């Protein structure tokens, strides 16, 4: 119940033969997994972190210019040459300057003039890559136990370290069996297209090709104290004002320009371990060995009293918190739901089956009431605690919200949203294959399109669809216009 | 700026997005439109930086 209150949770409920259900973790939301006889637990991918990062390429952000040396030839003969030109550390440029008797040359006319300065770089920008060998995912799993201090408690949990070498690490929950994780960590944010821009103690996960296409001069990338820099011509600005001579000026410090050139990148915390916090992971949940505590306990026949007022969460759960008043401590809590004094039992306990483990140890229950009046009976007898509640909503509204949530998931996850909570099945396989093919084609088409250009192109294409009448309307409009507007209204995550 | 000069158009100067001030050579000037330098980053609707 470290999952309550996040506002991003989403409940997986299915189960199959061998009781395996694959769910997807996104660093933002915490999954909840309910089952018929398995204790409902919750999962959250805490932090993805890498280690032993190599440096692929180094970029200069600002420079200093010293030792400006110049040389000119007599006009109409030869071309100005300078021994310092061949040096890798020196930036040079050739220009033509008028010369005459005033300048000492014999014959009037334009003559070449080369100026060579010393480009000693400063404030490098390292660009680091990570191999899949060292990437590590940490996963936290908690079963709904009804402990006193376990409402959205970020700390207490069970951690399982997942690495590509050994990706089938199974958690060992106390008194609940062993939840088995068999996940593929190769999929996810493809780290073969990630270069970390460690630039003055701020990292970023940019695309590889975009990093290679940064105009700033690039170094060899090896570990040296005086690396040679290629493409130095664009961070020093030679200025030939009029035609008498030319000066040499260093451009400046490119940090502010870099920060606005990274306006779409995702930030990652870089201090010590480069613990990335954005990303997603697909994992299978093998719940065969997993059991629930105290299925055989007797029922409670005593008084129950609320110790904290019931307050509905964002998704409809109400978080009942009660304390036992009887003398039989190792006992099971009863439950009942009536809509309009009718035992329709149209409710559900997101907790598996809450049980009191001590006489006066408070226990908290997460129940899902129906959409109307819902009288909830906890104890038995005339002393049964009665929690009146009223969930304000409609069933169709919940379906619309679920559809919107699924659409957002399909927009963020490429096609793994088709596997999120996909309990086996053959229909989901065909859906995933179709979506994979069409999404690959669609992203190959709309590679690197603006937040507003997507909306504009979508409007234009849906208008084209509404115009054409050769049954191109039906596919053009539906397949491109609506999809592209929906995407372009979401892309800026 | 930084021992350099340029002859820019007045309106273009007045248009560029940087935090300006009265330029009265007094101490502790108050800058307008400070939001052009600071960038607040709410990560997971958990906290702000």
């Amino acid at each position: 119940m470290r999952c309550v209150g996040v506002g991003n949770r989403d409940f997986v409920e299915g189960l199959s033969g061998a009781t395996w259900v694959d769910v997807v973790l996104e660093h933002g939301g915490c999954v909840t997994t309910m089952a018929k006889n398995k204790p409902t637990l919750d999962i959250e991918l805490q932090k993805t972190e890498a280690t032993q990062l190599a440096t692929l390429r180094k970029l200069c952000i600002e420079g200093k210019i010293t030792n400006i040396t110049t040389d000119s030839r007599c006009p109409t003969q030869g071309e100005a040459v300078l021994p310092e030109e061949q040096d890798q550390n020196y930036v040079c440029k050739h220009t033509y300057v008028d010369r005459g008797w005033g300048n000492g040359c014999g014959l009037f006319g334009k003559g070449s003039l080369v100026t060579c300065a010393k480009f000693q770089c400063l404030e490098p920008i390292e660009g680091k890559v990570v191999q899949y060998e060292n990437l590590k995912y940490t996963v936290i799993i908690t079963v709904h136990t009804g402990d006193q201090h376990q409402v959205g408690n970020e700390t207490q949990g069970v951690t399982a370290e997942i690495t590509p070498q050994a990706s089938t690490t199974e958690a060992i929950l106390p008194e609940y069996g062993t939840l088995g994780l068999e996940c593929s960590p190769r999929t996810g944010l493809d780290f073969n297209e990630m270069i970390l821009l460690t630039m003055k103690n701020k990292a970023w996960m940019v695309h590889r090709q975009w990093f290679f296409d940064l105009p700033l001069p690039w170094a060899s990338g090896a570990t040296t104290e005086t690396p040679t820099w290629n493409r130095k011509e664009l961070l020093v600005t030679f200025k030939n004002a009029h035609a008498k001579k030319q000066e040499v000026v260093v451009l400046g410090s490119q940090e502010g320009a870099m920060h606005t050139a990274l306006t779409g990148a995702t930030e990652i915390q870089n201090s010590g371990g480069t613990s990335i916090f954005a990303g997603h992971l697909k994992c299978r949940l093998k719940m065969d060995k997993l059991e629930l505590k105290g299925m055989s306990y007797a029922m409670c026949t005593n008084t129950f009293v609320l110790k904290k007022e019931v307050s509905e969460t964002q998704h409809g759960t109400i978080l009942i918190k009660v304390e036992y008043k009887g003398e039989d401590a190792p006992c099971k809590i009863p439950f009942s739901t009536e809509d309009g004094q009718g035992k329709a039992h149209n409710g559900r306990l997101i907790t598996a089956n809450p049980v009191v483990t001590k006489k006066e140890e408070p226990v908290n229950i997460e129940a899902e009431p129906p959409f109307g009046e819902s009288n909830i009976v906890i104890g038995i007898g005339d002393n049964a605690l009665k929690i009146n509640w009223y969930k304000k909503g409609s069933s169709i509204g919940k379906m619309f919200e679920a559809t919107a949530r699924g659409a957002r998931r399909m927009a963020i996850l490429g096609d793994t949203a088709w596997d999120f909570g996909s309990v086996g099945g053959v229909l989901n396989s065909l859906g995933k294959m179709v979506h994979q093919i069409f999404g690959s084609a669609y992203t190959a088409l709309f590679s690197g399109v603006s937040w507003v250009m997507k909306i504009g192109i979508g409007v234009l294409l849906t208008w084209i669809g509404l115009n054409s009448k050769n049954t191109s309307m039906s596919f053009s409009c539906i397949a491109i216009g609506i999809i592209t507007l929906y995407l372009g209204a979401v892309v800026q995550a | 700026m930084k021992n350099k000069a340029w002859m820019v158009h007045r309106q273009w100067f007045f248009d560029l997005p940087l935090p300006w001030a009265s330029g009265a050579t007094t101490e502790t000037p108050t800058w307008n439109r400070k939001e052009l330098l600071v960038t607040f980053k709410n990560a997971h609707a958990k906290k702000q930086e």
Partner: antibody
Amino acid sequence: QVELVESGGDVVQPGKSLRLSCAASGFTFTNYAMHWLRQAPGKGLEWVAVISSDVNDKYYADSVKGRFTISRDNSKNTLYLQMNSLTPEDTAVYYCAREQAVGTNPWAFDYWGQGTLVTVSS
Amino acid sequence: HIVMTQSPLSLSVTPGQPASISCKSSQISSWGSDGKTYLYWYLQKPGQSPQLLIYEVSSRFSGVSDRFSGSGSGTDFTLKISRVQAEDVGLYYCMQGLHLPLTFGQGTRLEIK
């Protein structure tokens, strides 16, 4: 590229006051808090006094509190330290530290001056 | 008046070897409002003026070699050097910037063994 050069350091007998001056260059001075730090020979670095961006606000180390005075001539781009009632203990190499260029602390050191030596002895 | 105690007082290490310097505080230097930890590490090279290596607990300063990295959360901070060169001779004075009367440590010394 910033250059902080010391001035005013010389010999002085105990009890005779002295005024130190820190000349600054390479940055806009009026926006930077400045510090005075000293290192007695063979002793750890010991911060002396700080003046913030606004001229009025100043603070001094308790070991030297009430004996020194720190002033800012930002129009001339220089810092002033006034040493009064000097003690033979108060002999050290004195430094001039700028405010941090990047960070969160209102007062920090990023660039240290070349250093001047003041000797208080008889 | 937080007093800074450093664990090592002399560190003689051969070149191409790691090194660990410890600067232990008398109080947690973690500013509550921002959650940062203001501990600085300077190096005064012999016959030179002090530099600034790591301007936080672990975020190194500009112009510093690749090997200098720090750590520590509340009171036990470290300065890790990966491969010692011949230029690392100096005095690694740590410092706390949490409180106004900021005080340096005694400062360790590094020499080539």
